[PDB]
A paper describes a structure:
Capsids are composed of a 183-residue polypeptide, the first 140 residues of which suffice for capsid assembly. The assembly domain is also unusual in that it polymerizes according to two different geometries i.e. T = 3 and T = 4 icosahedral quasi-symmetry. Accordingly, the same polypeptide chain exists in seven quasi-equivalent environments (A, B, and C in T = 3 capsids, and A, B, C, and D in T = 4 capsids).
The T = 3 and T = 4 capsids were reconstructed to essentially the same final resolution– 3.5 and 3.6 Å, respectively, and atomic models built into the resulting density maps. The structure of the T = 3 capsid described here is the first at high resolution for the apo form. The T = 3 A chain has the highest potential energy throughout the minimization process and the T = 3 C chain has the lowest with an initial potential energy 24% lower than the T = 3 A chain. The T = 3 AB dimer has the highest potential energy throughout the minimization process. The T = 3 CC dimer initially has a potential energy 42% lower than the T = 3 AB dimer and remains the lowest with continued minimization until replaced as such by the T = 4 CD dimer. The analysis was then extended to the T = 3 capsid. Here again, the CB interface was smaller, having ca. 20% less area, 19% lower free energy, and 30% less burial of V124. The same analysis performed on the three interfaces in the T = 3 capsid again identified F23, F122, and with lower confidence Y132, in all three interfaces. Three of the four quasi-equivalent dimers are asymmetric with respect to conformation and potential energy, however the T = 3 CC dimer is symmetrical and has the lowest potential energy while its intra-dimer interface has the least free energy of formation.
Residue numbers in the entry:
A (entry chain B), D (entry chain B): 1 to 143
B (entry chain A), C (entry chain A), E (entry chain C), F (entry chain C): 1 to 142
Write the structure that this text describes.
């Protein structure tokens, strides 16, 4: 249905159908980051923060969809459909899973408040047109 | 990569490669009852329990992949391709999504511990041969 | 030689020559659910309960005799011999191993006392003739 | 599966896929020892130590496999298969059941700590080659 | 069997097979820095801090490998096997020992926590795109 | 540069290139004992005692060398260079890693001082002639 997912974390999709697309790093890189940083933290029987839980389910999903891409590569003969589907996956679903993942890693590493404020500052940066923005966009100061 | 998805819920995927596949319901009725029961708790700005949060993320992914199937059927030409893809969606990954949903929903409306006991009891039910089987497997109620 | 195997579990082999043979499940699903439920407690350096310990030793013997059957099928020539042996394994001694497993596993997930009550209730169920029998024998849940 | 059985008693299979084969006494002798020493101790409704319990289940198993050997003797016509199976039983399964049994009797009689330390000392003895080992290998001093 | 040489220093091989390999500089510079900066501490027979001790054993092992390469060059004249050997050495063991030396030296000089948070920050930097990364990458502070 | 990996544990390579090499047994038995006896401590991410840590790094290095031998056997077909390589490995690095593993394991199990005085006693034993040595050589006591 029409649920707002981040509503319990203060954000909203309109606050993140707002950023550009290139900002979020590549998906493989997100997964490697999350795993290498929080391997034993995520494998543990503890819901120490819900960020971990949503992150965990999202990673399950992305594993399932990489399985989808591989499987479709294994069986579908129509090459246009194969290429089109794989591109749609890695592009649009890619964008959404990147939103989700990057958000949760950021909340973990720097705190939900810091990311919330960073997004507001980025928004004020990007609503501004080229003629008056700074050359560089803001950055996550952890304190 | 090495994720144990259900580790923070006192359960394990070993314990759900342990039910069968066909037991789980359709996604449609399941999603509908989830909505009708927890509209507010899902829309709220509150992490009332982690169950709600994992559920939110699952609904996101499911809606996005419904949009995927629809977009794919909007553009491709090979109908065999479209049918095969939308089967892989509604059948194979659907099993995963249904596992995840059914677990979290039942845990919400009943509790974690009751679900664990139910899974163990279904284990005792299904490992049993047919002849001395009960007539009706358990249907959980609070 | 005169061992009463289940004497330290408030039960007796008389009370399990009292169920039938066919009630017990396959070794495969049973072992699988055991693993999926008690991976850690079996791997741990802890005798959390004697049930775990007897279970460990049973899994050892079962794995070793699977290796036995495989080795025997690796070398012999007479296929009648191989089939007869691997039947004696998966059928006759399998019954013993399944008794032992099912008892300890069910006692783990539920408790000793619940298992005792279940056995007595199955006794009352099966000694009863078919006509006034219940439709479904008991399926234990916590 | 890949369980480590002795992990709750401090040992490990690598610590006992380490000894030689001749060391463990004959199986019939193990059973006679265990029975004559702890007949009423094992028949009792007491799990006074888990050693007793694992010992009890192991003896059940060996009874079942002696029944296997006898039964195969009763029915199998192919003599090579009969001899081969009986030898495999009394040899490899023999070795493993001897490991288990001797361990548990030792833990009972002398305490798990003493056997643990004895195994370490035996290991230090046997890793040493012939040129520098003592002529005799160590022995279970109960104190 | 499950030997992870970073388990007790707050990390794992995955966290170090997370950066690109090219960041970890060539072994010669590492050894030179180690010697020039801790001649005394590595010559000292005191188990001051375990980082030093791992570093000791690591340097001994690398010296052993260089001795091996020497023995090969001075005894095996054949070029194909020799070259493949030296490539395997300077590539795979090169990678591992570079990782190890960099981590331990950095932890000694600066500190454990600082190295870990540096890895995390460098990760999220290099994964992050160029148009919105910080202008200059992070770097270790005394 | 003057790297002596025993400097902080009360010894030196000379004191271990003092016994005959044949006393230090083959690597397989060492690794098996280490695993079977300290699976947990070597899997634990805690710098409990530096002996453990040196042992960790040493096992990683030996595994790396075995991986090297594997890579050579799976890529270099020439037998002369390959055989000379494996001989150098299983001889020289074999010696050093045997020395190291024996010392550290023994020190863990029994204690530092006991290993040192054992070396001293074994030395003065084997150097001493047969007609007036003790009847049986010394041996480590718990």
């Amino acid at each position: 249905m029409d649920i707002d997912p981040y509503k319990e974390f203060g954000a909203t999709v309109e606050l993140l159908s707002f950023l550009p697309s290139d900002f979020f790093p590549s998906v493989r890189d997100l997964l490697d980051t999350a795993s290498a940083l929080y391997r034993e933290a995520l494998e543990s029987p503890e819901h120490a923060s819900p960020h971990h839980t949503a992150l965990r389910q999202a990673i399950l999903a992305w594993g399932e969809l990489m399985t989808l891409a591989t499987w479709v590569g294994n069986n579908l003969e129509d090459p246009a459909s194969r290429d089109l589907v794989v591109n749609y996956v890695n592009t649009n679903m890619g964008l959404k899973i990147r939103q989700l993942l990057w958000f949760h890693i950021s909340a973990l590493t720097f705190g939900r408040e810091t990311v919330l404020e960073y997004l507001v500052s980025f928004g004020v940066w990007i609503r501004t047109p080229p003629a008056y923005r700074p050359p560089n966009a803001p950055i996550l100061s952890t304190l």
